[PDB]
Coordinates of C-alpha atoms and ligand atoms in Angstrom, one line a residue:
Chain A
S1 CA -11.2 -5.5 -11.8
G2 CA -8.9 -2.6 -11.2
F3 CA -5.2 -3.1 -10.3
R4 CA -3.6 -1.5 -7.2
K5 CA -0.1 -1.3 -5.8
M6 CA -1.0 -3.7 -2.9
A7 CA 1.0 -4.7 0.2
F8 CA 0.5 -7.9 2.2
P9 CA -1.8 -7.6 5.2
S10 CA 0.7 -6.5 7.9
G11 CA -1.0 -8.0 11.0
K12 CA 1.3 -11.1 11.3
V13 CA 4.4 -8.6 11.3
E14 CA 2.7 -6.0 13.6
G15 CA 2.7 -8.8 16.2
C16 CA 6.5 -9.0 16.0
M17 CA 7.5 -5.4 16.2
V18 CA 9.4 -4.3 19.4
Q19 CA 11.3 -1.2 20.5
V20 CA 15.0 -1.7 21.1
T21 CA 17.0 0.9 23.2
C22 CA 20.8 0.8 23.7
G23 CA 22.0 3.9 25.6
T24 CA 20.2 6.9 23.9
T25 CA 19.6 5.2 20.5
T26 CA 16.0 3.7 20.0
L27 CA 14.9 1.8 16.9
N28 CA 12.6 -1.2 15.9
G29 CA 13.4 -4.9 16.4
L30 CA 11.6 -8.0 15.0
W31 CA 10.7 -10.5 17.8
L32 CA 10.4 -14.1 16.5
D33 CA 10.4 -16.9 19.0
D34 CA 12.8 -16.0 21.9
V35 CA 15.1 -13.8 19.6
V36 CA 14.8 -10.0 18.8
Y37 CA 16.5 -9.0 15.5
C38 CA 17.6 -5.3 15.2
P39 CA 20.3 -3.3 13.3
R40 CA 23.7 -3.5 15.2
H41 CA 24.1 0.3 15.0
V42 CA 21.6 0.5 17.9
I43 CA 24.9 0.3 20.0
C44 CA 26.3 3.5 18.2
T45 CA 26.3 7.2 19.2
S46 CA 26.1 9.1 15.9
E47 CA 29.8 10.0 16.8
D48 CA 30.4 6.2 16.7
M49 CA 28.6 6.1 13.2
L50 CA 31.5 8.0 11.5
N51 CA 33.9 5.0 11.8
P52 CA 32.4 2.4 14.1
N53 CA 34.3 -0.8 15.1
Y54 CA 31.1 -2.8 16.1
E55 CA 33.1 -5.7 17.7
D56 CA 34.9 -3.1 19.9
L57 CA 31.7 -1.1 20.7
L58 CA 29.9 -4.4 21.6
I59 CA 32.5 -5.4 24.3
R60 CA 31.2 -2.3 26.2
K61 CA 27.5 -3.7 26.1
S62 CA 25.9 -6.3 28.3
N63 CA 22.5 -8.1 28.0
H64 CA 21.0 -5.5 30.4
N65 CA 22.1 -2.5 28.2
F66 CA 19.6 -3.7 25.5
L67 CA 16.2 -2.5 26.6
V68 CA 13.5 -4.4 24.7
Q69 CA 9.9 -3.3 25.0
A70 CA 6.8 -5.1 23.4
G71 CA 3.7 -3.0 23.8
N72 CA 4.4 -1.4 27.3
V73 CA 6.1 -4.6 28.7
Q74 CA 9.9 -5.0 29.0
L75 CA 11.4 -8.3 27.8
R76 CA 14.4 -9.7 29.8
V77 CA 17.5 -10.1 27.6
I78 CA 19.4 -13.3 28.6
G79 CA 21.7 -13.3 25.5
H80 CA 23.1 -11.2 22.6
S81 CA 25.3 -11.9 19.6
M82 CA 26.2 -10.1 16.3
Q83 CA 25.5 -11.7 13.0
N84 CA 26.9 -9.6 10.2
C85 CA 25.1 -6.2 10.6
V86 CA 22.2 -7.4 12.9
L87 CA 22.1 -8.1 16.6
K88 CA 20.1 -11.2 17.8
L89 CA 18.9 -10.5 21.4
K90 CA 17.9 -13.7 23.2
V91 CA 14.9 -12.9 25.4
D92 CA 13.4 -15.2 28.2
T93 CA 9.9 -15.2 26.5
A94 CA 9.0 -16.6 23.0
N95 CA 6.9 -14.1 21.1
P96 CA 3.4 -15.7 21.5
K97 CA 2.3 -14.1 18.1
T98 CA 5.4 -15.5 16.2
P99 CA 3.9 -16.5 12.8
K100 CA 5.4 -19.3 10.7
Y101 CA 8.4 -17.6 9.0
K102 CA 11.5 -17.9 6.9
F103 CA 14.4 -15.6 6.3
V104 CA 15.0 -15.2 2.6
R105 CA 17.6 -13.1 0.6
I106 CA 15.7 -11.8 -2.4
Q107 CA 17.1 -10.9 -5.9
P108 CA 16.9 -7.4 -7.4
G109 CA 13.5 -6.9 -9.0
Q110 CA 11.7 -8.8 -6.2
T111 CA 8.9 -6.9 -4.5
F112 CA 8.0 -7.0 -0.8
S113 CA 5.8 -5.1 1.7
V114 CA 7.4 -2.7 4.3
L115 CA 5.8 -2.2 7.7
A116 CA 7.3 1.2 8.6
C117 CA 7.6 1.4 12.4
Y118 CA 8.7 4.0 15.0
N119 CA 9.5 3.0 18.7
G120 CA 8.3 -0.6 17.8
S121 CA 4.9 0.7 16.7
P122 CA 3.7 0.4 13.0
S123 CA 2.9 3.7 11.2
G124 CA 2.1 2.3 7.7
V125 CA 2.5 -0.4 5.1
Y126 CA 3.7 0.0 1.5
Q127 CA 5.0 -2.3 -1.4
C128 CA 8.6 -2.0 -2.6
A129 CA 11.1 -3.6 -4.9
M130 CA 14.8 -4.4 -4.4
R131 CA 16.2 -2.0 -7.1
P132 CA 18.8 -3.5 -9.6
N133 CA 21.3 -1.3 -7.7
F134 CA 20.3 -3.1 -4.4
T135 CA 18.7 0.1 -3.0
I136 CA 14.9 0.4 -2.2
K137 CA 12.9 3.7 -2.6
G138 CA 11.2 3.6 0.8
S139 CA 9.6 6.1 3.1
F140 CA 11.7 6.1 6.3
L141 CA 12.3 8.8 8.9
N142 CA 14.8 8.6 11.9
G143 CA 13.7 5.7 14.2
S144 CA 12.4 3.6 11.2
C145 CA 15.6 1.5 11.4
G146 CA 14.6 -2.2 12.2
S147 CA 11.4 -1.9 10.2
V148 CA 11.2 -5.1 7.9
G149 CA 10.3 -6.1 4.4
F150 CA 8.4 -9.3 3.9
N151 CA 6.3 -11.5 1.5
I152 CA 3.5 -13.8 2.8
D153 CA 3.0 -17.3 1.3
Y154 CA -0.5 -18.2 2.9
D155 CA 0.5 -18.4 6.6
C156 CA 4.4 -18.1 6.2
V157 CA 6.0 -14.7 6.5
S158 CA 9.3 -14.6 4.4
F159 CA 11.3 -11.7 6.0
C160 CA 13.6 -10.4 3.2
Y161 CA 14.7 -7.0 4.4
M162 CA 15.5 -4.9 7.6
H163 CA 15.9 -1.2 7.2
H164 CA 19.4 0.2 8.2
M165 CA 20.4 3.3 6.2
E166 CA 19.4 6.4 4.1
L167 CA 22.1 7.2 1.4
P168 CA 22.9 10.9 0.8
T169 CA 20.4 10.7 -2.2
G170 CA 17.6 9.7 0.1
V171 CA 17.3 6.1 -1.2
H172 CA 17.4 3.3 1.3
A173 CA 19.7 0.4 2.1
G174 CA 19.3 -2.6 4.5
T175 CA 20.1 -6.2 5.2
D176 CA 18.5 -9.6 4.9
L177 CA 17.6 -11.0 8.3
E178 CA 21.1 -12.7 8.5
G179 CA 22.4 -9.1 8.6
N180 CA 24.1 -9.1 5.1
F181 CA 23.5 -5.8 3.2
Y182 CA 21.8 -5.9 -0.2
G183 CA 24.5 -4.3 -2.4
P184 CA 27.9 -3.0 -1.4
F185 CA 26.7 -0.7 1.4
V186 CA 28.1 -0.6 5.0
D187 CA 26.5 0.7 8.3
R188 CA 28.8 3.8 8.4
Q189 CA 28.0 7.6 8.1
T190 CA 30.3 7.8 5.0
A191 CA 29.2 9.0 1.5
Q192 CA 28.1 5.8 -0.4
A193 CA 26.7 6.2 -3.9
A194 CA 24.1 3.9 -5.6
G195 CA 24.7 2.4 -9.1
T196 CA 22.5 2.9 -12.1
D197 CA 18.8 2.5 -11.0
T198 CA 17.6 0.4 -14.1
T199 CA 13.9 -0.3 -14.8
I200 CA 13.0 -4.0 -13.9
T201 CA 11.9 -5.0 -17.5
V202 CA 10.2 -8.3 -16.5
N203 CA 8.1 -6.3 -13.9
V204 CA 7.1 -3.7 -16.6
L205 CA 6.0 -6.6 -18.9
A206 CA 3.9 -8.2 -16.0
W207 CA 2.3 -4.8 -15.4
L208 CA 1.5 -4.4 -19.2
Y209 CA -0.2 -7.8 -18.9
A210 CA -2.1 -6.6 -15.8
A211 CA -3.2 -3.6 -17.9
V212 CA -4.6 -5.7 -20.7
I213 CA -6.3 -8.0 -18.2
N214 CA -8.0 -4.8 -16.7
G215 CA -9.1 -3.3 -20.1
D216 CA -6.2 -0.8 -20.7
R217 CA -5.2 -2.0 -24.3
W218 CA -4.4 1.2 -26.3
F219 CA -0.7 0.4 -26.2
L220 CA -1.0 -3.1 -27.8
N221 CA 0.8 -2.7 -31.2
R222 CA 0.9 -4.9 -34.4
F223 CA 4.7 -5.8 -33.9
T224 CA 6.7 -8.6 -32.4
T225 CA 10.5 -8.7 -31.7
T226 CA 13.3 -11.0 -30.5
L227 CA 15.0 -11.0 -27.1
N228 CA 18.2 -9.7 -28.8
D229 CA 16.5 -6.9 -30.7
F230 CA 14.4 -6.1 -27.6
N231 CA 17.5 -6.0 -25.4
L232 CA 19.4 -3.5 -27.7
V233 CA 16.4 -1.1 -27.1
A234 CA 16.3 -2.1 -23.4
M235 CA 20.0 -1.3 -22.9
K236 CA 19.6 2.1 -24.6
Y237 CA 16.7 3.0 -22.2
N238 CA 18.4 1.7 -18.9
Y239 CA 16.0 -1.3 -18.8
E240 CA 17.5 -4.5 -17.4
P241 CA 18.2 -7.2 -20.0
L242 CA 15.3 -9.7 -20.5
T243 CA 16.3 -13.5 -20.2
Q244 CA 14.4 -16.6 -21.3
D245 CA 14.0 -17.0 -17.5
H246 CA 11.9 -13.7 -17.5
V247 CA 10.0 -15.0 -20.6
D248 CA 9.3 -18.4 -18.8
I249 CA 7.9 -16.6 -15.7
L250 CA 5.6 -14.4 -17.9
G251 CA 4.2 -17.6 -19.6
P252 CA 1.0 -17.7 -17.5
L253 CA 0.1 -14.0 -18.3
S254 CA 0.9 -14.8 -22.0
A255 CA -1.6 -17.7 -21.8
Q256 CA -4.4 -15.8 -20.1
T257 CA -4.2 -12.8 -22.5
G258 CA -3.2 -14.7 -25.7
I259 CA -0.3 -12.1 -26.1
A260 CA 3.0 -13.9 -26.8
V261 CA 5.7 -12.5 -24.5
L262 CA 7.8 -11.2 -27.4
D263 CA 4.7 -9.4 -28.8
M264 CA 4.3 -7.6 -25.4
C265 CA 8.1 -6.9 -25.6
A266 CA 7.5 -5.2 -29.0
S267 CA 4.7 -3.1 -27.5
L268 CA 7.1 -2.0 -24.6
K269 CA 9.8 -1.2 -27.2
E270 CA 7.3 1.2 -29.0
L271 CA 6.3 2.7 -25.6
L272 CA 10.0 3.4 -24.9
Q273 CA 10.6 4.8 -28.5
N274 CA 7.3 6.7 -28.8
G275 CA 6.6 7.5 -25.0
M276 CA 2.9 7.6 -23.6
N277 CA 1.9 10.8 -25.7
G278 CA 0.1 12.0 -22.5
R279 CA -1.9 8.7 -22.1
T280 CA -1.9 6.5 -19.0
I281 CA -1.8 2.8 -18.3
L282 CA -3.5 1.7 -15.1
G283 CA -3.6 5.4 -14.0
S284 CA 0.2 5.7 -14.4
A285 CA 1.9 8.1 -16.9
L286 CA 5.2 6.0 -16.7
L287 CA 5.8 2.3 -17.0
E288 CA 5.5 0.6 -13.5
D289 CA 8.2 -1.9 -12.6
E290 CA 7.3 -2.8 -8.9
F291 CA 4.9 -5.6 -9.7
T292 CA 6.4 -9.1 -10.3
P293 CA 4.7 -11.6 -12.6
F294 CA 3.8 -13.5 -9.4
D295 CA 2.3 -10.2 -7.9
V296 CA 0.2 -9.7 -11.1
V297 CA -1.0 -13.3 -11.0
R298 CA -1.7 -13.2 -7.2
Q299 CA -3.7 -9.9 -7.4
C300 CA -5.5 -10.9 -10.7
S301 CA -6.6 -14.3 -9.0
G302 CA -7.3 -13.1 -5.4
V303 CA -4.8 -15.4 -3.5
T304 CA -5.2 -15.1 0.4
Chain B
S1 CA 13.0 10.7 3.5
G2 CA 11.2 9.2 0.5
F3 CA 7.4 9.4 0.1
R4 CA 5.3 6.3 -0.5
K5 CA 1.6 5.6 -1.1
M6 CA 1.1 4.1 2.4
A7 CA -1.8 2.1 3.9
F8 CA -2.5 1.8 7.6
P9 CA -1.3 -1.4 9.2
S10 CA -4.2 -3.8 8.6
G11 CA -3.8 -6.1 11.6
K12 CA -6.7 -4.5 13.7
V13 CA -9.1 -5.0 10.6
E14 CA -7.7 -8.5 9.7
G15 CA -9.0 -9.6 13.2
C16 CA -12.6 -8.5 12.2
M17 CA -12.9 -10.2 8.8
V18 CA -15.4 -13.1 8.5
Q19 CA -16.9 -15.2 5.7
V20 CA -20.7 -14.8 5.3
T21 CA -22.6 -17.4 3.2
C22 CA -26.3 -17.1 2.4
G23 CA -27.5 -19.9 0.1
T24 CA -24.8 -20.2 -2.6
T25 CA -23.5 -16.6 -2.3
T26 CA -20.3 -16.1 -0.1
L27 CA -18.7 -12.7 0.6
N28 CA -16.8 -10.9 3.5
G29 CA -18.3 -9.5 6.7
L30 CA -16.9 -7.2 9.4
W31 CA -17.3 -8.7 13.0
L32 CA -17.3 -5.9 15.6
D33 CA -18.6 -6.8 19.1
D34 CA -21.5 -9.3 18.7
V35 CA -22.6 -7.9 15.2
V36 CA -21.4 -9.0 11.7
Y37 CA -21.8 -6.3 9.0
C38 CA -22.1 -7.5 5.3
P39 CA -23.6 -6.3 2.0
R40 CA -27.3 -7.2 1.9
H41 CA -27.0 -8.7 -1.6
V42 CA -25.5 -11.7 0.2
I43 CA -29.2 -12.9 0.1
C44 CA -29.4 -12.5 -3.7
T45 CA -29.0 -15.1 -6.6
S46 CA -27.5 -13.1 -9.5
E47 CA -31.0 -13.6 -11.0
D48 CA -32.3 -11.6 -7.9
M49 CA -29.6 -8.9 -8.7
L50 CA -31.4 -7.8 -11.9
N51 CA -34.3 -6.2 -9.9
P52 CA -34.1 -7.3 -6.2
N53 CA -36.7 -6.3 -3.6
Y54 CA -34.5 -6.9 -0.6
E55 CA -37.3 -6.6 2.0
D56 CA -39.2 -9.4 0.1
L57 CA -36.1 -11.5 -0.4
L58 CA -35.3 -11.1 3.4
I59 CA -38.7 -12.6 4.5
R60 CA -37.4 -15.9 3.0
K61 CA -34.2 -15.8 5.2
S62 CA -33.9 -16.9 8.9
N63 CA -30.9 -16.4 11.4
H64 CA -29.8 -20.0 10.4
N65 CA -29.6 -19.3 6.7
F66 CA -26.7 -16.8 7.4
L67 CA -23.5 -19.0 7.8
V68 CA -20.8 -16.9 9.5
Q69 CA -17.3 -18.4 9.7
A70 CA -14.3 -16.7 11.6
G71 CA -11.2 -18.7 10.8
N72 CA -12.5 -22.2 10.6
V73 CA -15.1 -21.8 13.5
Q74 CA -18.8 -21.1 12.8
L75 CA -20.6 -18.2 14.7
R76 CA -24.2 -18.7 15.8
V77 CA -26.5 -16.1 14.4
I78 CA -29.2 -15.1 17.0
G79 CA -30.5 -12.0 15.1
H80 CA -30.5 -10.2 11.7
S81 CA -31.7 -6.8 10.5
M82 CA -31.3 -4.7 7.3
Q83 CA -29.9 -1.1 7.7
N84 CA -30.0 0.6 4.3
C85 CA -27.8 -1.7 2.0
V86 CA -26.0 -3.7 4.8
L87 CA -27.1 -6.6 7.0
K88 CA -26.3 -6.6 10.7
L89 CA -26.1 -10.3 11.9
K90 CA -26.2 -10.5 15.7
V91 CA -24.0 -13.4 16.8
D92 CA -23.8 -15.0 20.3
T93 CA -20.0 -14.2 20.6
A94 CA -18.4 -10.7 20.8
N95 CA -15.4 -10.6 18.5
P96 CA -12.5 -10.9 21.1
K97 CA -10.2 -8.9 18.7
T98 CA -12.8 -6.0 18.3
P99 CA -10.6 -2.8 18.2
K100 CA -11.8 0.6 19.4
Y101 CA -13.9 1.8 16.4
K102 CA -16.2 4.4 14.8
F103 CA -18.3 4.3 11.7
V104 CA -17.6 7.5 9.7
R105 CA -19.1 8.7 6.4
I106 CA -16.1 10.4 4.6
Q107 CA -16.2 13.3 2.1
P108 CA -15.0 13.0 -1.6
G109 CA -11.2 13.5 -1.6
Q110 CA -10.7 11.6 1.7
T111 CA -8.3 8.8 1.6
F112 CA -8.5 5.4 3.4
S113 CA -6.9 1.9 3.4
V114 CA -8.8 -1.1 1.9
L115 CA -8.1 -4.6 3.2
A116 CA -9.2 -6.7 0.1
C117 CA -10.6 -10.0 1.4
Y118 CA -11.9 -13.3 -0.2
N119 CA -13.9 -15.9 1.9
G120 CA -13.2 -13.6 5.0
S121 CA -9.4 -13.9 4.5
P122 CA -7.3 -10.8 3.7
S123 CA -5.3 -10.9 0.4
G124 CA -3.9 -7.4 0.4
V125 CA -4.0 -3.8 1.6
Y126 CA -3.9 -0.6 -0.5
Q127 CA -4.6 3.2 -0.1
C128 CA -7.6 4.8 -1.9
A129 CA -9.6 8.0 -2.1
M130 CA -13.3 8.6 -2.4
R131 CA -13.4 10.1 -5.9
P132 CA -15.3 13.4 -6.4
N133 CA -17.9 11.3 -8.3
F134 CA -18.2 9.0 -5.1
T135 CA -16.6 6.0 -6.8
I136 CA -13.2 4.5 -5.7
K137 CA -10.6 3.0 -8.1
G138 CA -10.1 -0.3 -6.2
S139 CA -8.8 -3.7 -6.9
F140 CA -11.7 -6.1 -6.3
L141 CA -12.6 -9.5 -7.9
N142 CA -15.8 -11.6 -7.2
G143 CA -16.0 -12.4 -3.5
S144 CA -14.3 -9.1 -2.5
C145 CA -17.7 -7.7 -1.5
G146 CA -17.7 -6.9 2.3
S147 CA -14.0 -5.9 2.2
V148 CA -13.8 -2.5 4.2
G149 CA -12.1 0.9 3.9
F150 CA -10.7 2.5 7.1
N151 CA -8.5 5.1 8.7
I152 CA -6.7 4.5 12.1
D153 CA -6.4 7.4 14.7
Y154 CA -3.8 5.7 17.1
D155 CA -5.9 2.8 18.4
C156 CA -9.3 3.7 16.9
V157 CA -10.3 2.2 13.5
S158 CA -12.7 4.6 11.7
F159 CA -14.5 2.3 9.2
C160 CA -15.6 4.5 6.3
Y161 CA -16.4 2.1 3.4
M162 CA -17.7 -1.4 2.6
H163 CA -17.3 -2.8 -0.9
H164 CA -20.6 -3.6 -2.8
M165 CA -20.3 -3.1 -6.6
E166 CA -18.2 -2.8 -9.7
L167 CA -19.8 -0.4 -12.3
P168 CA -19.6 -1.4 -16.0
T169 CA -16.5 0.8 -16.3
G170 CA -14.6 -1.3 -13.6
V171 CA -14.7 1.5 -10.9
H172 CA -16.1 0.6 -7.5
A173 CA -19.0 1.7 -5.4
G174 CA -19.9 0.9 -1.8
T175 CA -21.5 2.1 1.4
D176 CA -20.5 3.6 4.7
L177 CA -21.0 1.1 7.6
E178 CA -24.6 2.3 8.1
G179 CA -25.3 0.9 4.6
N180 CA -25.7 4.2 2.7
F181 CA -24.0 4.3 -0.7
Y182 CA -21.5 6.9 -1.5
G183 CA -23.0 8.7 -4.5
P184 CA -26.3 7.8 -6.3
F185 CA -25.5 4.1 -6.8
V186 CA -27.9 1.2 -5.9
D187 CA -27.1 -2.5 -5.3
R188 CA -28.7 -3.7 -8.6
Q189 CA -27.2 -5.2 -11.8
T190 CA -28.4 -2.2 -13.9
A191 CA -26.1 0.1 -15.9
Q192 CA -25.1 2.9 -13.6
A193 CA -22.6 5.6 -14.9
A194 CA -20.1 7.6 -12.8
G195 CA -20.0 11.4 -13.1
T196 CA -16.9 13.4 -14.0
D197 CA -13.8 11.9 -12.2
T198 CA -12.2 15.3 -11.2
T199 CA -8.7 15.7 -9.7
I200 CA -8.7 16.4 -5.9
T201 CA -6.9 19.7 -6.1
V202 CA -6.2 20.1 -2.3
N203 CA -4.6 16.5 -2.4
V204 CA -2.4 17.4 -5.4
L205 CA -1.1 20.5 -3.5
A206 CA -0.4 18.4 -0.4
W207 CA 1.6 16.0 -2.5
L208 CA 3.5 19.0 -4.1
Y209 CA 4.4 20.0 -0.6
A210 CA 5.5 16.3 0.2
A211 CA 7.6 16.6 -3.0
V212 CA 9.4 19.8 -1.8
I213 CA 9.9 18.3 1.7
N214 CA 11.6 15.2 0.0
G215 CA 13.9 17.3 -2.3
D216 CA 11.9 17.2 -5.6
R217 CA 11.8 21.1 -6.2
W218 CA 12.2 21.5 -10.0
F219 CA 8.5 22.5 -10.5
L220 CA 8.6 25.4 -8.0
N221 CA 8.0 28.5 -10.2
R222 CA 8.5 32.3 -9.5
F223 CA 4.7 33.0 -9.7
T224 CA 1.8 33.3 -7.3
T225 CA -2.0 33.5 -8.1
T226 CA -5.4 34.0 -6.4
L227 CA -8.0 31.4 -5.6
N228 CA -10.3 32.9 -8.4
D229 CA -7.5 32.9 -11.1
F230 CA -6.3 29.5 -9.9
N231 CA -9.9 28.1 -10.0
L232 CA -10.5 29.3 -13.7
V233 CA -7.4 27.1 -14.6
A234 CA -8.6 24.3 -12.3
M235 CA -12.2 24.2 -13.8
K236 CA -10.5 24.1 -17.3
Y237 CA -8.4 21.0 -16.3
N238 CA -11.3 19.1 -14.4
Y239 CA -9.6 19.9 -11.1
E240 CA -12.0 20.4 -8.1
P241 CA -12.4 24.1 -7.0
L242 CA -10.0 25.1 -4.2
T243 CA -11.7 26.8 -1.1
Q244 CA -10.2 28.8 1.8
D245 CA -11.0 25.6 3.7
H246 CA -8.5 23.7 1.5
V247 CA -6.0 26.6 2.0
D248 CA -6.5 26.5 5.8
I249 CA -5.8 22.7 5.8
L250 CA -2.6 23.2 3.8
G251 CA -1.3 25.9 6.3
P252 CA 1.0 23.5 8.2
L253 CA 2.7 22.3 4.9
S254 CA 2.9 26.0 3.9
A255 CA 4.7 26.7 7.3
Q256 CA 7.2 23.8 7.1
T257 CA 8.2 24.6 3.5
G258 CA 7.9 28.5 3.6
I259 CA 5.9 28.2 0.3
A260 CA 2.6 30.2 0.6
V261 CA -0.4 28.1 -0.5
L262 CA -1.2 30.4 -3.4
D263 CA 2.4 30.2 -4.6
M264 CA 2.2 26.4 -4.7
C265 CA -1.2 26.9 -6.5
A266 CA 0.7 29.0 -9.1
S267 CA 3.3 26.2 -9.5
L268 CA 0.4 23.7 -10.0
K269 CA -1.2 26.1 -12.6
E270 CA 2.0 26.1 -14.6
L271 CA 2.3 22.2 -14.3
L272 CA -1.3 22.0 -15.7
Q273 CA -0.5 24.5 -18.5
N274 CA 3.1 23.3 -19.4
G275 CA 2.8 19.5 -18.4
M276 CA 5.7 17.6 -16.8
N277 CA 7.9 17.8 -20.0
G278 CA 8.9 14.1 -19.3
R279 CA 10.0 14.9 -15.7
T280 CA 8.7 13.2 -12.6
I281 CA 7.7 14.3 -9.1
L282 CA 8.1 11.7 -6.3
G283 CA 8.6 9.1 -9.1
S284 CA 5.2 9.9 -10.7
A285 CA 4.8 11.3 -14.3
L286 CA 1.3 12.7 -13.3
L287 CA 0.1 14.8 -10.4
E288 CA -1.0 12.5 -7.5
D289 CA -4.3 13.3 -5.8
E290 CA -4.7 10.3 -3.3
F291 CA -2.7 11.9 -0.4
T292 CA -4.6 14.3 1.9
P293 CA -2.8 17.2 3.7
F294 CA -3.3 15.0 6.9
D295 CA -1.7 12.0 5.1
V296 CA 1.3 14.1 4.0
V297 CA 1.8 15.5 7.6
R298 CA 1.3 12.0 9.1
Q299 CA 3.9 10.3 6.8
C300 CA 6.3 13.3 6.9
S301 CA 6.2 13.2 10.9
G302 CA 6.0 9.3 11.4
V303 CA 2.7 9.1 13.4
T304 CA 1.9 5.6 14.8
Ligands
LIG1 C1 17.1 4.4 10.4 C2 17.2 5.0 11.7 O1 16.3 4.9 12.5 N1 18.3 5.7 12.0 C3 18.6 6.4 13.3 C4 19.8 5.8 13.9 O2 20.8 5.5 13.0 C5 20.7 6.3 11.8 C6 22.0 6.0 11.0 C7 22.1 4.8 10.3 C8 23.3 4.6 9.5 C9 24.2 5.5 9.5 F1 25.4 5.3 8.8 C10 24.1 6.7 10.1 C11 22.9 6.9 10.9 C12 19.4 6.0 11.0
LIG2 C1 -18.3 -7.8 -4.9 C2 -18.7 -9.3 -4.9 O1 -18.1 -10.1 -4.2 N1 -19.7 -9.6 -5.8 C3 -20.1 -11.0 -5.9 C4 -21.6 -11.1 -5.5 O2 -22.3 -9.9 -5.9 C5 -21.7 -9.2 -7.0 C6 -22.7 -8.2 -7.5 C7 -22.9 -7.0 -6.7 C8 -23.8 -6.0 -7.2 C9 -24.5 -6.3 -8.3 F1 -25.3 -5.3 -8.8 C10 -24.3 -7.4 -9.1 C11 -23.4 -8.4 -8.6 C12 -20.4 -8.7 -6.7

């Protein structure tokens, strides 16, 4: 028992982290097979960052301008291309610790682990969600760019995120591993504002299930509701709308607890309308939305 | 910027996790050099757990009754001893992935990362504190016993915890890696109650510093206080007393923010007396106490 904000074990991703240096700029890359993936702004002076033309800036760069270091050994770059906002550096050595992997583009509400790195060395691991405004609320200092987000399915690392940017509000933006930004963000030192940071309703419901499963039951009410009635209250509280797809996904938690999804919805509705009254659920004073239904099931069943 | 509950990268500890089976009981062990460390109750039937005499139960066990599996390869046990509540199984093979390590017994308030494992396989990593009642609030199902807590100083894993027990309240108890329980707990299926779970005051202060550093400043008040005046309010709120040793340790955060420690104490005092009024600090509605001053400095400076 107990329920913790839990990241994947990071070992498989630690074995992929390299330092990439172009001129004076150093950040992290992800070495998978004979390719190193890094943010393309590695080629930029922070003067360049104000209005970079990456294609033009790239003409000035050769294979040998990209310095790739894995531990304290340099990799030979024999190839470089730009894919969207990432650089793929072909190296002459396949990463011997390459895990089985996929590149996946996740949806808002999806959670993943970040291995925060500096000079290609891991400093820490935490669990995140893609916000409904396609930002993440990370922990990232200068040099953290190239750090990646991932899920693990048994032995397969699904890489879903690469860190690129801190917005003026101190929330984070980045790309999938094909270099396409989540949201409308661009790799340019220009004021860019996030949209409404809504609560991930399906993730709150999952976590209310995790709470019941772990003995925290004080908030279970005697009410039910409908998706439409629930959604009127959701909209009012900047909660994301709940779909039959969200209800479907919560079914297994519904089964294990004997609490119908719409009953748990009615409990959430009262928690929105009444607040916590100084109480806590799983040692939180606010409703947590960075556990997916899959996360709750995984942690509640001990998947490895 | 941003501030996350952050675990150490787990890779160095993943490379140490084995499955230990004695009779029908399977849990996790920690393989360091040619020794596997596991909870001694691995020898117990849950019938044995009601009033075990471990010395007597151990007489009945030989080297070959302890089945140690690392990945899908069996290690040969050539030796076994009991040290307090752990078994040390001598194996004929040094763990080739043994990191540099220390065994350390941590103080209440000290944080560490848990790699939660099942059948010697890692399922997840989270950050904990030793509570002032020498419990931890973990996430641990059946088979999680032998999972370890650790800190990393650059390349040196300090192992501080091994999971042994869930108390009837669903909080956790375990040993240092010399097999001595944190607190008054024993490895027996007998009702054992935790003492008062106090807030780790020095850790709250650290986290208020982390908040200011990351732009959350609304709670900074115009007051200061004294350790004695602060401690009268602390005692009243089941906060641990604050010592000049806690103040000393906060000095670097004091320096970086220009907020005297006793001024931050007075801000905390008002937050206790006034509550949050529905506001949040670093996306929490309650005062976080599982970041040490060292943790805040580490994450705020990007140590690897
Ligand atoms: C994340 C990171 O390491 N850095 C340092 C180099 O680039 C910085 C940057 C990114 C985007 C941008 F628009 C300006 C600066 C962030
Ligand atoms: C933690 C774990 O895996 N287990 C399974 C086997 O032993 C269980 C146990 C420990 C202590 C106790 F007093 C009773 C049962 C916990």
